[PDB]
Design an enzyme around this catalytic site. Structure first.
Site, PDB file in Angstrom:
ATOM      1  N   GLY A  23      -1.430  35.658  57.066  1.00  0.00           N
ATOM      2  CA  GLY A  23      -1.191  35.300  55.675  1.00  0.00           C
ATOM      3  C   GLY A  23      -0.062  36.085  55.037  1.00  0.00           C
ATOM      4  O   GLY A  23       0.716  36.689  55.770  1.00  0.00           O
ATOM      5  N   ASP A 136      -4.043  36.085  39.621  1.00  0.00           N
ATOM      6  CA  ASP A 136      -3.633  35.093  40.584  1.00  0.00           C
ATOM      7  C   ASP A 136      -4.823  34.350  41.259  1.00  0.00           C
ATOM      8  O   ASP A 136      -4.909  34.183  42.456  1.00  0.00           O
ATOM      9  CB  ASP A 136      -2.663  35.713  41.601  1.00  0.00           C
ATOM     10  CG  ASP A 136      -1.739  34.685  42.196  1.00  0.00           C
ATOM     11  OD1 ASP A 136      -1.608  33.552  41.664  1.00  0.00           O
ATOM     12  OD2 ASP A 136      -1.124  35.012  43.216  1.00  0.00           O
TER      13      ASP A 136
END
Length: 284
Positions: A23, A136
């Site tokens: 990721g 986020d």
């Protein structure tokens, strides 16, 4: 300096076996790794500091915020190591994948959506009670363990109690984009966008250029969930997506919303979702 910074003579290349990429954060690549002393799997984010500039303060704040959290709903931080010019940040490994990955095989049902939103709310209740703002929240940052546990990840833009313009456009609250004074309620708006994402697979305006998105969010009435979804789910989305922050409920209140109470079930059932993804990925 950096909370959790390990002995500069500790060679993270000696302490960890670095494996495949998995990721990306605000500032670097992420790899699955193995702690060579315990044999536990970890997530290792590697940042090149020679390459950073006027961001380092951001990396520093990410790590400090992470280091201050101790919750079953927030990814753990195990420490940092400096190797030549690269910073190794050791984090909790969640093997189930993100909620966004789990959507790849097909839609979720409302018990799965309610269960995931309930756990995200437990993480936001914790962060907000600690005077922190995630900033986020989105499906890609909601991670699952192989047991179906749900945790919040990626604090690259996390705040501490603001008017800074941070976040991923499609999930940003109107007041965050206009750089008005904002607080934990901005995470509640992002939760509403994430609820739309968990139901439909993408957030509102997903097919538009992010620059258009910048003027549409403050200008348009807020998004609503469109489609054949339950009235409690559509109302949970509307509660979160009010343009007036004071009109959005707190995370603690949302944990008692009828959509959550009538539909969420134990997190262990999410292993079915993780299996579905594994079977799907196995073909492909």
């Amino acid at each position: 300096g950096l909370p959790g910074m390990q002995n500069l003579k500790a060679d993270p290349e000696e302490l960890f076996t670095k494996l495949e990429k998995i990721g990306k954060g605000s500032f670097g690549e992420v790899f699955k790794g193995i702690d060579n002393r315990t044999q536990k799997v970890v997530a290792i984010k590697i940042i090149d500091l020679e390459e950073a500039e006027d961001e380092i303060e951001d990396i520093q704040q990410e790590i400090t915020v992470l280091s201050q959290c101790d919750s079953p709903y927030v990814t753990k931080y195990y420490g940092s190591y400096l190797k030549d010019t690269k910073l190794w940040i050791i984090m909790e490994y969640l093997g189930g994948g993100s909620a966004l990955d789990l959507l790849e095989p097909g839609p979720l049902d409302e018990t799965q959506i309610a269960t995931i939103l309930r756990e995200i709310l437990k993480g936001l209740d914790y962060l907000h009670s600690e005077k922190k703002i995630h900033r986020d929240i989105k499906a890609a940052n909601v991670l699952l363990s192989e047991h179906g546990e749900v945790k919040l990840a990626d604090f690259g833009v996390a705040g501490q109690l603001r008017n800074t313009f941070v976040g991923t456009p499609f999930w940003m609250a109107p007041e965050v984009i206009k750089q008005s004074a904002y607080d934990s309620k901005a995470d509640i708006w992002s939760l509403g966008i994430t609820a739309i994402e968990l139901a439909r697979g993408e957030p509102p305006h997903s097919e538009l250029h992010p620059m258009k998105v910048l003027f549409l969010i403050p200008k348009n009435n807020p998004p609503t969930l469109e489609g054949n979804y339950s009235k409690p789910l559509k109302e949970f989305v509307e509660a979160c997506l009010n343009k007036e922050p004071s009109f959005r409920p707190t995370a603690k209140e949302l944990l008692k919303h009828k959509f959550i109470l009538r539909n969420a079930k134990k997190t262990s059932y999410l292993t079915e979702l993780i299996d579905r993804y594994k079977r799907w990925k196995a073909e492909q």
